[PDB]
Amino acid sequence: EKPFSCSLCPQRSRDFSAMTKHLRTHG
Ligand SMILES: [Zn+2]
């Protein structure tokens, strides 16, 4: 299995904390 990548977008986060902002920052 690979790290934790997002659903729609070529990016990855190390902790849900940052992965969350990514969603609130999606657009
Ligand atoms: Zn995303």
Swiss-Prot record:
Zinc finger (C2H2-type): 4-26
Tissue expression pattern: Isoform 1 is testis-specific and is not expressed in lymphoid organs such as thymus or spleen. Isoform 2 is expressed in both B- and T-lymphoid cells.
Location in or out of the cell: Nucleus
Family: Belongs to the krueppel C2H2-type zinc-finger protein family.
Domain comment quoted from the record: The C-terminal zinc finger domain functions as a transcriptional transactivator. The BTB (POZ) domain possesses repressor activity.
Self-association and partners: Homodimer (via PTB domain). Interacts with the N-terminal of FANCC. Interacts with ZBTB16. Interacts with GATA3.
Function: DNA-binding protein that binds to the to a 5'-TGTACAGTGT-3' core sequence. May function as a transcriptional transactivator and transcriptional repressor. Probably exerts its repressor effect by preventing GATA3 from binding to DNA. May play a role in regulating the differentiation and activation of helper T-cells.
Name by which UniProt lists this protein: Zinc finger and BTB domain-containing protein 32
Source organism of the structure: Mus musculus (Mouse)
Phylogenetic placement of the source organism: Eukaryota, Metazoa, Chordata, Craniata, Vertebrata
Residues represented out of the complete protein: 375 to 401 of 465
